[PDB]
Symmetry: D2
Subunit: 216 residues, 4 copies
């Protein structure tokens, strides 16, 4: 049926052993790749940079080239999917997440669970020193008919001027096979840009996305 | 108070998108480093090798050298701890886990949650071809007073004769500071051996452990 | 200070302990990114897939966007640069290289040294089962004014249908500071395509390259 | 077929694009694992911490347990071996090396080539702030009869108190098959300790080593 138009998210888990829990709703344009989302904390002030919740804070808004359904869009009413992502940061920290969804017509409800640990007390996550995430190219491959293995190098700029880097791998597992015509076009890349306004208790996130097999 | 003598575990999560859930109980000797555990499935036959649940299936049974309390033993009645472990396998699979505990006198109850994804359909986890885990040396460092960052190279032998390898990092976060005299002895290593008997629904696990700063 | 038009390569080292040595020459168009190269073995038949020598077989041919010189082209007559590249393969093999260059007007001479090891005897490098390399996006960052640290995920298709993957990092070190206006545009990405035809003793290589900051 | 008693090393390459070259000699006891080595620079003051040249500054000095020859000692008069080592540092730097040897009776001559790059100008290698290397356990596996693939996590202490970490993999490739009875004992671990005293031009290095399968 339809592409999604609106979504909500409950995201919870712990960073360095401290529990956090946020929820909120947003919307987007699934032909353009754009979405935005507001979150508010249920457990008081975040003790860590809200920027570490990106990329984790909805590829059902991502089309494939020339208006084709991405595998995420096609699965939405046919079998669904989950994601499992790993971020391994340069200073020894790690952050994993599980991503699950429920659809009600053109509305997506996400339930994401995250565990992040090992962030140094004086590093840029626990001092709120991340300032922006660099624009990013995601590389996707499909090693079998129901799995995407994707990877990107993820870097934030920070207040000291040094970037903060992590290796990010995302495995996406589908309830039914991906269409043969999607499977034959590998690798697929996706260019993304994000913005985030935030306080200690609230986030306003925006993201643009565009898949490509080749450039102009 | 006492070192632990008995424990139980509920461990659940998903592998390649399929949910699993096991529970059972065991016991050990916290002066010798030895424990054993029985698990039985609540959700029918496992669709994956039970060996992939090791190392995940209790360092409160591990003493430090010369009968000293390990940081895990000392935290047990003073602040507690959690663990976050990552296994990144050579064929692109990933498995993360969160480890939490509740103590009632000398009894430990564990509640572990795992997400593993990306195991190839013909690889050794999804074909039940893992045969044993190699003996292993864990290296621990304490980058601050409440955190252990530990690492080991984890390898199983398999029915084809080829080993199956992963990089394993475990971040352990303590509710109160680790004692100064433990913090000053780094790195600490731990030698471990495990055995596992299993069926599609039940596991019988055993593990021996011995911490060392140097060898004979 | 001309852009390069032609280039030679001597590339030697070992794979799994077996010494190899190739040389040959090629040409390209430094306004368009394209280059091509022929190589011939000086030590008999190669005992491994010639495809493993890609990406290692000249970013002086890469312009930056809108007719700008890339940092590689600008260094060419002003301090030079070297590269150090690491390939870490999914099956435990590793391949490192050192890249150095000498320029004579618009001609480049490359001298590259490689050590690869730990390729399984039944894997696709030692069985010559690599069939092509996937198109690739390289992400570059400049952590200081004389260094590029670049990364890509590098995958071959193989005769079995199973891809063969490696993490690739390339650190490029310049003899003089990169221009401030290049340093401000980060990350920079580069999209590349390669072809290779080969025999046991010869390689005929082609590459297209194009830098982009956005799509 | 004597065990080694004495050794020389010529080690050269570059760190962050700056060429370096050292040579010197040492000795050790191949029944006990210990060796020591002196090196002196042929190109002026080192511009980086000499500690970064450890572990790279001779497992022919390592016996295996119970007076057994290690695979390195047995290859010494029977086909030899080379090593390829990769150090991947937590701050993005990389250091690879190629190790080759020539034997004359009980003397070893090493010729090692290294390329390190991407060390931050304010990090502890380029500020000479590494103070010691932590004691270390090396895990070895033999995926086929002529290869060792070994791994350790390598950490220095520094003057700031913050350790400096790297993933280290060493692939060793033999000219003849390793003995079946060595191949059956896997993993094998090796516990090592090092010391280094240094100046801008000289290094005085000591190492203790002991193989173990169990404790």
């Amino acid at each position: 049926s339809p592409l999604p138009a609106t979504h909500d998210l409950h995201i919870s888990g712990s960073i360095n052993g401290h529990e956090f829990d946020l929820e909120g709703s947003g919307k987007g344009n699934a032909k353009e790749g754009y979405q935005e989302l507001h979150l508010k904390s249920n457990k008081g002030d975040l003790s860590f940079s809200p920027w570490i919740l990106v990329p984790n804070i909805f590829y059902q808004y991502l089309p494939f080239p020339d208006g084709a359904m991405s595998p995420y869009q096609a699965a939405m009413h046919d079998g669904g999917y989950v994601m499992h992502r790993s971020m391994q940061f340069e200073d020894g920290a790690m952050l994993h997440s599980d991503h699950r969804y429920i659809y009600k017509g053109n509305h997506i409800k996400g339930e994401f669970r995250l565990t992040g640990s090992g962030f140094p007390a004086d590093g840029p996550v626990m001092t709120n020193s991340l300032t922006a995430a660099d624009w990013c190219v995601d590389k996707l491959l499909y090693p079998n008919d129901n799995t995407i293995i994707g990877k990107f190098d993820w870097t934030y700029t920070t207040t000291s001027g040094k970037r903060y880097q992590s290796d990010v791998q995302t495995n996406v597992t589908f309830g039914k096979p991906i269409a043969a015509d999607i499977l034959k076009k590998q690798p697929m890349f996706v260019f993304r840009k994000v913005e985030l306004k935030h306080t200690k208790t609230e986030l306003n996130f925006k993201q643009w996305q565009k898949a490509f097999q080749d450039i102009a």
